[PDB]
Design a protein around this nucleic acid. Structure first.
Ligand code: MG
Ligand code: MG
Ligand code: MG
Ligand code: MG
Ligand code: MG
Ligand code: MG
Ligand code: MG
Ligand code: MG
Ligand code: MG
Ligand code: MG
Ligand code: MG
Lengths: 143, 206, 60, 62, 262
RNA sequence: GAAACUGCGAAUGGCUCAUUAAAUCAGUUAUGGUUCCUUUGGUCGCUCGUACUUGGAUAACUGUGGUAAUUCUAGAGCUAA
RNA sequence: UCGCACGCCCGGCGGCGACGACCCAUUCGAACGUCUGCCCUAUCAACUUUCGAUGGUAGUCGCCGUGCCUACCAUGGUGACCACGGGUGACGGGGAAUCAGGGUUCGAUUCCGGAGAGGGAGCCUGAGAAACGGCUACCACAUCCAAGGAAGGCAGCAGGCG
């Protein structure tokens, strides 16, 4: 379950040792009409870099990419696609950018190949600057 | 000098970025504080913007909070027992943020016995002849004895904490950054966090 | 070795052209800012105690 | 950095073919009729004509 | 640049100062102050190039340090002081009071007013702060951080300030129907009623403004300065009254004026 | 009012294109992730425990000097913030 | 602390300014980031990686965010949509020249941003410098001398050599 690291993994704000005689979870809404998910409230994970249950603000840009690799832990790689217009030829090129985004463990079942909305935040690592804000499934793939 | 650069290291792709400028001053690093336990010695460092930082080097006392009953006291630090960062920071006794120290429980025992008038610690058989605990525990008026009686139903403590009080020293976790701010402030470990770190220290002993 | 001797209680100072090593062995090999008996440079000077307050080298 | 303009413009233009006989005869007739001193002062008036005419063409395309 | 820059080239100056290309390499760098670098008009530009009370910067210095000019009810003695929007620059010997508003174009205008109008001016509130003992603070566009304001005055409104006490008198809430000056952008100097408010979470919000003669136009909030309740301002408006009639209408109104004058 | 101490500037400007190929740079945004002399506006009896003004240096000044030589400086006396 | 006028209670209250300072806005900024964009080369097709490469955790440092650095774990990250490597007689851009429409070449250079003061490195002071008409060295070059030492940096304006 939880507490698999060296230090105690706890949400900083809520104080869990008030005397009695279950644990209250900290969550928020990130805004922009993004509805905070159900697993972020009934969840038992803690996360420093979760957009809903952590100390990150979603601010600036709102992008959307396509999940290609989910091998990094608590973060994944999305693949953005776009058509670039050269002006000599009146045509397009298919280019792409691979950015690494932080995938909170509230979005539980995510497979490769589904369009994911990400949101700009503070720089979370060397190459991570975006959190996953909502997930929609692929074409079909409801099985 | 010692620097904090994104330009000195490789790209996301693994390629080498060639530098276009020198080491600027604002991309600055400094040697670590490596704060030890001893009679206090704080150096000030001149900072960007004309500010100052207080590096502890030796640091004997710190302001620790007992969060369940809300009393923080200046308390002397005796040992560092755990560090999630590194074991050599336990070995060479080093105070950082989120390192786990032992502090003597005597000011918290004084506050608890002043507030509730019940013995805490106190391996029974010993009794203090200098009568200070006696005038602490006794001599209440009839109007205020029911006030202390109303308090002493909310005066029960955890058994792990009571073991640490009978030991005379309790576990705290530091939350201030002593190389940055100067202090060794922190909080007494309680409950699930407490038994988590007690399980870690027991696993370290073996 | 020129010697610039100053007396502060009268505030009067004078350079004296001592060139005698048997006069100067009493000031030799001592560290700065010590009080030395000055009877060696002259029989006329006796009971004068003097602080060695540092000078200038032969290259200035 | 100095405080001066550097905005300048050629007022004339040279023709593409340098020795076209009918162009030479037509320009010589014009400068002889109107008393001119060289051919840059007929080339500049033809160039100002060309700028006005291309402005007119660009407005007619609007 | 290893620090703060202190000059400004004549070419790189903001254009609504209307400084000539040829007479200088440098433009006067505005000192730091209650207005931004490109939003303000320097007092040397206000005296020398436009009023022509002075001829050169030395005469500007002499005017400014005989302690004559009194901007926002206080005398400033530096040549390059930033005098920005809605500022009251007063001259006591000529008895002449000037209020700084953009005209129909983007530039500032010499705008003579009365002393009864010069006793006050108007300010857009930028932010409401709460201070160190629960003390409400209101911050204007010219950094006038008067505290304990009226608790109905909120973020994007305007207030009227009596300058001698330096204190609020009345206010206009940012609401539809009120007049507004467009203090920035491409609509710089227009006057019209606020007809629509379009919210955008995250990005900047815009406002549709319908002028005196029907021509509506959109502008984001940061460039908008409300100037009075309803269809009437609380200040005196300049010549043109904030329309930006087209270039054809400007052309035939100057042509008919020259034809009628002769 | 020379000098000298103190405060401020000297990090702007001027020159050049060697480096540097998602780097610099352009448009666009964010700092809810920070620092900011100065300017302007706020606050500057909020604390509950010799002031009718406290201390002693030091430069300029004076007077001995050293060095082939420098915007090199030593020792002795004074005297302010 | 400093300067102008100098008053009024019955020794005490007083006007107008200067200077100085915790913090807060504001200004001039700065610095890190977000998205998109650049010339040639495959006789450059795999590169990065416990000597940080990609993340997670917890810290150190820094003004702050962040492998920036350290410890412990995970084995990732980019690439045929041209990565990586190499070249450039490559500072980028606003723009310039030629031009029907297309484009082609140039942009050392008066505006903006960058970088740099022979080469690299290190740092004091200061709000702001890794500053060079500031120091500290080392390399190269070079000035004076009594041979012990001292002083230097025109890719600023002139000018000289090459
Ligand atoms: Mg084409
Ligand atoms: Mg410069
Ligand atoms: Mg080259
Ligand atoms: Mg080059
Ligand atoms: Mg160029
Ligand atoms: Mg070149
Ligand atoms: Mg430099
Ligand atoms: Mg050279
Ligand atoms: Mg310089
Ligand atoms: Mg340097
Ligand atoms: Mg020089």
């Amino acid at each position: 379950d939880i507490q698999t690291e060296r230090a105690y993994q706890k949400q900083p704000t809520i104080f869990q040792n008030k005397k009695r005689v279950k644990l209250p979870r900290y969550y928020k809404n990130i805004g922009l009409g993004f509805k905070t998910p159900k697993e972020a409230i009934e969840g038992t994970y803690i996360d420093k870099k979760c957009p809903f249950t952590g100390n990150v603000s979603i601010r600036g840009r709102i992008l959307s990419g396509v999940v290609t690799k989910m091998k990094m832990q608590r973060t994944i790689v999305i693949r953005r696609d776009y058509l670039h217009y050269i002006r000599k030829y009146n045509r397009f090129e298919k280019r792409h950018k691979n950015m690494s985004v932080h995938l909170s463990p509230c979005f539980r079942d995510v497979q490769i190949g589904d369009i994911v909305t990400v949101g700009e935040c503070r720089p979370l690592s060397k190459t991570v600057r975006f959190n996953v804000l909502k997930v929609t499934k692929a074409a079909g793939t409801k099985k | 000098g010692i620097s904090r650069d994104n330009w000195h290291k490789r790209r996301k792709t693994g390629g080498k970025r060639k530098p276009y400028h020198k080491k600027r001053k604002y991309e600055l690093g400094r040697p670590a504080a490596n704060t030890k336990i001893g009679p206090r010695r704080i150096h000030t460092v001149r900072v960007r913007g004309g500010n100052k930082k207080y590096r502890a080097l030796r640091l004997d006392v710190g302001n620790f909070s007992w969060g369940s009953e809300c009393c923080t006291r200046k308390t002397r630090i005796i040992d560092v027992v755990y560090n999630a960062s590194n074991n050599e920071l336990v070995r060479t006794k080093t105070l950082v943020k989120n390192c786990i120290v032992l502090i003597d429980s005597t000011p918290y025992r004084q506050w608890y016995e002043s507030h509730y008038a019940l013995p805490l610690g106190r391996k029974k058989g010993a009794k203090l002849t200098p009568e200070e605990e006696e005038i602490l525990n006794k001599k209440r008026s009839k109007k205020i004895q029911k006030k202390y009686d109303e308090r002493k139903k909310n005066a029960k403590i955890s058994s792990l904490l009571e073991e640490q009080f009978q030991q005379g020293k309790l576990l705290a976790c530091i939350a201030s950054r002593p190389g940055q701010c100067g202090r060794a402030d922190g909080y007494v470990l309680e409950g699930k966090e407490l038994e988590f770190y007690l399980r870690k220290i027991k696993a370290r002993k073996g | 070795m020129k010697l610039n001797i100053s007396f502060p209680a009268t505030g009067c100072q004078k350079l004296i052209e001592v060139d005698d090593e048997r006069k100067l062995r009493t000031f030799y090999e001592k560290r700065m800012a010590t009080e030395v008996a000055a009877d060696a440079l002259g029989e006329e000077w006796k009971g004068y105690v003097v602080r060695i307050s540092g000078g200038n080298d032969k290259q200035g | 950095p100095v405080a001066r303009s550097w905005v300048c413009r050629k007022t004339y233009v040279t023709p593409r073919r340098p020795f076209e006989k009918s162009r030479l005869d037509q320009e010589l007739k014009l400068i002889g009729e109107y008393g001119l001193r060289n051919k840059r002062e007929v080339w500049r008036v033809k160039f100002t004509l060309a700028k006005i005419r291309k402005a007119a063409r660009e407005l007619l395309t609007l | 640049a290893r620090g703060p820059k202190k000059h400004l080239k004549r070419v790189a100056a903001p254009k609504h100062w209307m400084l000539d290309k040829l007479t200088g390499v440098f433009a006067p760098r505005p000192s730091t102050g209650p207005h931004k670098l490109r939003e303000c008009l320097p007092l040397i530009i206000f005296l020398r190039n436009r009023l022509k009370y002075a001829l050169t910067g030395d005469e500007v210095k002499k005017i400014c340090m005989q302690r004559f000019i009194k901007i926002d009810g206080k005398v400033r003695t530096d040549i390059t002081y930033p005098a920005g929007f809605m500022d009251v620059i007063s001259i006591d010997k000529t008895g002449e009071n000037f209020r700084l508003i953009y005209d129909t174009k983007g530039r500032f205008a010499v705008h003579r007013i009365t002393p009864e109008e010069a006793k006050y001016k108007l300010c857009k509130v930028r932010k409401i702060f709460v201070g160190t003992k629960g003390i409400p603070h209101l911050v204007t566009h010219d950094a006038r951080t008067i505290r304990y304001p009226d608790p109905l005055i909120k973020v994007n409104d305007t207030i009227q300030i009596d300058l001698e006490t330096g204190k609020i008198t009345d206010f206009i809430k940012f609401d539809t129907g009120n007049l507004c000056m467009v203090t920035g952008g491409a609509n710089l100097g227009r006057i019209g009623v606020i007809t629509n408010r379009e919210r955008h979470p995250g990005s900047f919000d815009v406002v549709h403004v319908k002028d005196a003669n029907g021509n509506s136009f959109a502008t984001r909030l940061s460039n908008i300065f409300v100037i009075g309740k309803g269809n009437k301002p609380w200040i005196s408006l300049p010549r043109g009254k904030g329309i930006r009639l087209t270039i054809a209408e400007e052309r035939d109104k100057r042509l008919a004026a020259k034809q009628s004058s002769g």
